Amino acid sequence: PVPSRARVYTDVNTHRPSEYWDYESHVVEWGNQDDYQLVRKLGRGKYSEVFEAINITNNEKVVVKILKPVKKKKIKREIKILENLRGGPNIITLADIVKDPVSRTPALVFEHVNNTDFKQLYQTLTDYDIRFYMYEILKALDYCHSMGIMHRDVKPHNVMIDHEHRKLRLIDWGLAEFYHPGQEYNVRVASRYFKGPELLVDYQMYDYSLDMWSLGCMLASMIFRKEPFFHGHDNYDQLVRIAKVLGTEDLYDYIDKYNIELDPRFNDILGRHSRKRWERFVHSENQHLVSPEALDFLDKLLRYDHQSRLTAREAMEHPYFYTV
Amino acid sequence: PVPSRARVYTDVNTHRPSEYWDYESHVVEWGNQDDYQLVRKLGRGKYSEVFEAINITNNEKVVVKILKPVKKKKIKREIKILENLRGGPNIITLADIVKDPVSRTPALVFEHVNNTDFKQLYQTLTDYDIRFYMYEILKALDYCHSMGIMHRDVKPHNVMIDHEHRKLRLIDWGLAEFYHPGQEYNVRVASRYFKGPELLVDYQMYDYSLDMWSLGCMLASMIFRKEPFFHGHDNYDQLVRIAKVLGTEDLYDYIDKYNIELDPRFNDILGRHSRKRWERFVHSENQHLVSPEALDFLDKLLRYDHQSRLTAREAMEHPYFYTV
Ligand SMILES: O=P(O)(O)O[C@H]1[C@H](OP(=O)(O)O)[C@@H](OP(=O)(O)O)[C@H](OP(=O)(O)O)[C@@H](OP(=O)(O)O)[C@H]1OP(=O)(O)O
Ligand SMILES: Nc1ncnc2c1ncn2[C@@H]1O[C@H](COP(=O)(O)OP(=O)(O)O)[C@@H](O)[C@H]1O
Ligand SMILES: Nc1ncnc2c1ncn2[C@@H]1O[C@H](COP(=O)(O)OP(=O)(O)O)[C@@H](O)[C@H]1O
Ligand SMILES: COc1ccccc1-c1ccc(CN)cc1Cl
Ligand SMILES: [Cl-]
Ligand SMILES: [Mg+2]
Ligand SMILES: [Mg+2]
């Protein structure tokens, strides 16, 4: 397969010392969980149990993500990445790294966010709200991309929104990774609906643009009121669901441009599909959220070719955000 | 001790939401320092290392103040105040807040000022130049005072003057504080020469008028060519240097009025002093910078009683500024 490199922030990690990007050598200092009293369960997940808590030393509400001890390299990478991004625009703030004395279970302590419900926002968000919140996510992505980090799990559940205070935080940095140009990464990242074509065709030399695909999936689901936009039932089907909108002609041009090898499992399910016009997804239910600007912006995000996709910084200059 | 409050802008912070002055809760968004390339060192305070720099995204000269990580509350207060005052007349403009990815060191980014040398100005400034620059500082003071902020470190080193373009900027807002009427403040603020009598007698319920005393010290050093005007060798000796000029009779009256208690360490050193006439400091070396209006203005700034001092707004109305 043909090699590939990011169009932006290509060498930001190469021009930094080992200590910045080397998470496996970085020393983590685990505090005492006794400084925090647990209140209520909030969420759950891929090897985690989130709780609301109070820091008993200053009476502040915090969130305690109690990690299910899986690969130690993974915990170290999340801690290193959160530590490197701490302070960044719309990035969840890691406040402490603690261990419960008895259980010895690793736990991460974050700033508390009053998360408005996915279904509650999906019903109340105006055309202005979409542009505003999309822009806020772009601040977070351009920032972590400038810091040489690919989030690799962009989706609505990993975006905490407090609509009342108009606050947005990009959370769940457990799959995030340092970008090193020419590196081959595991393609078993991101949630199925948000997986870029590069992960589905098993093209390992992917970059920050992966997150731009995932962001495109989110925008399409909001403006068209169709969640998820690309509804795959499995990883193989996921590509088919992409091809049914972007067409099979550009999919082959993409695989050919990078000399990728398809899985014999695909020919029997892929088929032949025409490219669809973005306006065909417009209906009475969503037309108040749709605009020519929105369709042009989406079309520039949802591209098979990961190099042809708008960068977070280019995305910030798009006419769709002029009203913000 | 008797309570006291400012004569102007007394309740400006009380009539504003918590967001405005609660710097400890305010969320700071740290950008990427990679947008800036460092050129050279400029200054080196007790709290920071100041560097000239280039913004590599637009080829603009900026100043990057690399904060030595001391109390986090202090950094937050400085940021919040700079953010609140951003745009004000003759106030240094905070352009960015960034952190170097590797060092994770907090740094503040300001507009660049071509600072003319303290000793170079002291030798070239005419009677007119003094009146002009004195007025520009007053604009900055009246502004931050109207915004409920006390600079608390007014002195020539924290005033940047670009004489060529006649530009003045009040910098170094790291000791600045929100004024809340009736609050007791730490008296270990300002530089020794510029400390108002209230700090020396350990009177904690001080206001904006502290900034007017410091300004008076600056004026006296310029018009009389004697830097510093009140040359204390320590914080106790500092009150003695003032009393040798203002006299010990008014000193005691001031102490009695607010019921302040003197430190047994002043007994042996204070002594008895007559009030000196301001014309006693006129000599051949400085007589071209002195005038009756200059002496009247100074006399109205250099008063023991912090409530009897001109406010920045009253000072602008003074006959000393009619030629400007
Ligand atoms: O005598 P001090 O109370 O200490 O303070 C200063 C200082 O004195 P020192 O540095 O010798 O301690 C000046 O000295 P420099 O810093 O310039 O070297 C000195 O000036 P000269 O060296 O010119 O004598 C000046 O005295 P003056 O301005 O009256 O000549 C004097 O100031 P005070 O009289 O205000 O204390
Ligand atoms: N800072 C936070 N504020 C509020 N809720 C949070 C926060 N972090 C996590 N949660 C809740 O926990 C859930 C899982 O958190 P996340 O970090 O995504 O863990 P996982 O990796 O298990 O998904 C989120 O969907 C959210 O409901
Ligand atoms: N905007 C600026 N333009 C030019 N020089 C500056 C500027 N800001 C700071 N400096 C230089 O840096 C020095 C120290 O800056 P300052 O804000 O006073 O820091 P500190 O509180 O650590 O003393 C100043 O005395 C001045 O020489
Ligand atoms: C005693 O100083 C002053 C008195 C009156 C007016 C201006 C100044 C002044 C302010 C800042 C700088 C720059 N370091 C230089 C000077 Cl001369
Ligand atoms: Cl200077
Ligand atoms: Mg400064
Ligand atoms: Mg300074």
Numbering used by the authors:
A (entry chain B), B (entry chain A): 4 to 327
Please quote the paper that reports this structure.
CK2 is a serine/threonine kinase that is a key regulator of many cellular processes and is involved in cellular proliferation and anti-apoptotic mechanisms. In vivo it exists mainly as a holoenzyme composed of two catalytic (α and/or α′) and a dimer of regulatory (β) subunits, but it can also be found as the isolated subunits. Unlike most other kinases it is constitutively active and more than 300 proteins have been identified as CK2 substrates, making it probably one of the most pleiotropic proteins in eukaryotic systems. Hence, CK2 has been recognised as a highly promising target for anti-cancer therapies.
Modelling studies indicated that 1 contains the right vectors to grow into the Tyr channel by substitutions on the 2-position of ring A. The compounds tested so far were not able to effectively inhibit the protein activity as ATP was not displaced. Indeed, most of the co-crystal structures featured a molecule of ATP/ADP in the ATP binding site as well as the ligands bound in the αD pocket.
